Amino acid sequence: SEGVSNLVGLPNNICLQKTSNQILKPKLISYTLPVVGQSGTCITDPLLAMDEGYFAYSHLEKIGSCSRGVSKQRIIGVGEVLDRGDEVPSLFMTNVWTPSNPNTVYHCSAVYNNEFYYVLCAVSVVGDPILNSTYWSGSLMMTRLAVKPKNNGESYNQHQFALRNIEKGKYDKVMPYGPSGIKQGDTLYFPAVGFLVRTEFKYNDSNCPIAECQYSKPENCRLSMGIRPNSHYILRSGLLKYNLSDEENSKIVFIEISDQRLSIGSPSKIYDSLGQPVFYQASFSWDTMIKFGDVQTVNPLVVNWRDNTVISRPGQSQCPRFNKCPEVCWEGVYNDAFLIDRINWISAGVFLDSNQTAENPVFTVFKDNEVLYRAQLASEDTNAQKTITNCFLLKNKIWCISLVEIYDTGDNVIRPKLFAVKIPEQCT
């Protein structure tokens, strides 16, 4: 055995009962992927993607403080997900690529297809494209890493494509902006975002939902559609589509998201669960409550957002946790969820249990209006920021792996941590 499969079919029963018992028992599993191990350098900008018993990983290592440090290394790797022997899954890396200049690579994203990962990624000499947006050249790079490297074989193991032809429509720029994507047949879909000049953004403020929000003004979401109300651009999430069956390697197409539940363009994720794609979008604006759901159509993109009333994200100012009313802000965090059962929608993710600060990461199995069960991944006072969760099967048992950026209690340096959590069957 020792083989990891995607969640498909009727997995072994999980606990469907809301409980307080400490039935979730996480495993720290980051020791077989030793890339993370470090002593005080800051590791940031994490990427974990899993598909079909393989995975993609990435981080950026900066010398100095996590916020003003200097980029030292960019690592983009791929490997296999296997049972280490005790019926616990763990990541083992097979192929690593180090970009020549770390200061050019931003906002990578990964999609698996037929024994390769493709990591679409943004190239910028002006800085972070989101922060210095009007000057970003707009260029994109496509790396392709083989999950099964072959000895003395080049252009199979690693291959770089320059995307000359970008179909952007009305947008000036498009960009990978999310960890994970899906494959459908021969075509790859990356979570992406588009930069649209605000004065070309057609919106009626009569469409802003100010119901039960006395203190909210109708322009608010029209304004909060960019990082500042002034912003030359607004951001709109969607997908970057890449058809491998296309003759040339140049063309990549943008697909915008529906105007349902529109929220500022956010780090997003499209993934496969139990037979359909589910789409998640981070909340960086007034709609703090989690937004993710089944994908009715990938192109055009329309997402059946769950009316979740229990899961949210922290926010320091003007958009704290549990805010459902339109306001101008650009704050939040990427804590995604991954569906485990669709018959009853039960999903798993690591969320920060705080109103304002980014502390107390908690692994949480929940339905729309209720949280079935929790397990705290660190002390309640522990500061952590971003969580990426993916779930799969191991001997038909549902397992998740969550990457959690966690801060040292004494150092203030942050490092990614890898937890494996088995969803139990029994509620005792």
């Epitope: 500061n383 801060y407 203030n412």
Partner: antibody, heavy 129, light 108 residues
């Protein structure tokens, strides 16, 4: 060169409303995200009263004062105003106009580091009958 | 709000000394501490941002460190110019909070 200047009565009667107005010269209010009012009682630490959005209607107030405090703006003059009702002698203080700076490092990490990069000279308001 | 307990409230050192002011936070503010200097009848000047970063034009003798809950500003060689009430600003969650300030005096 961007600069601030506070204008105010200097003395307020107890139990009546204090008001102050900051004039911004060297740049428009519509160019900076948040502007704020903060105060320092004599022989005591700095307190942060609250902010107004530079180019939006949004406001945030310190909950020690939220019931009493109203922060407004006049874009035609580059002015923004503080109105602190029902003043107690505890509210005698030097009041500083100030503007806010936000430092970001990554566009997939919207957690700005906040501080105040430009201040006014400060105006003392006394709360005495 | 997050309270900042700054200490010592007062201080006095000869020129050429090393001064250390420290400041703790009710909760964890990772890297979100600003260190300010204010001189009589003037506005506050920012010396340190993001815990350890000297702002341009500020002497090298000013230095800042942090553990998330304890934050220490160090003046390596006190000079006559550096006499002021020094202050904390936690710039993470709103309401923003200031330390109570500490008055560095010089001995002669």
């Amino acid at each position: 060169q961007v600069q601030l200047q506070e204008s105010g009565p200097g003395v307020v009667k107890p139990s009546e409303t204090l008001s102050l107005t900051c004039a911004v010269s060297g740049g428009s209010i519509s160019d900076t995200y948040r502007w704020s009012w903060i105060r320092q009682p004599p022989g005591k630490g700095l307190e942060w009263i609250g902010y107004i959005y530079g180019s939006a209607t949004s406001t945030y107030y310190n909950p020690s004062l939220s019931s009493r405090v109203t922060i407004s703006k006049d874009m035609s003059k580059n002015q923004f105003s503080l109105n602190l009702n029902s003043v107690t002698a505890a509210d005698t203080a030097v009041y500083y106009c100030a503007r806010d700076y936000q430092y970001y490092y990554s566009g997939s990490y919207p957690t700005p580091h906040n501080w105040f990069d430009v201040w006014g000279p400060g105006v003392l308001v006394t709360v005495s009958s | 709000d997050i309270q900042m307990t700054q200490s010592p409230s007062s201080l006095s050192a000869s020129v050429g000394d090393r001064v250390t002011i420290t400041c703790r936070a009710s909760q964890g503010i990772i890297d979100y501490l600003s260190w300010y200097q204010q001189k009589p009848g003037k506005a506050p000047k920012l010396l340190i941002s993001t815990a350890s970063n000297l702002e341009s034009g500020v002497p090298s003798r000013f230095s800042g460190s942090g553990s998330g809950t304890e934050f220490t500003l160090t003046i390596s060689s006190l000079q006559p110019e550096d006499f002021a009430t020094y202050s904390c600003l936690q710039g993470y969650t709103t309401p923003y909070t200031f330390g109570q300030g500490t008055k560095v005096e010089i001995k002669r």
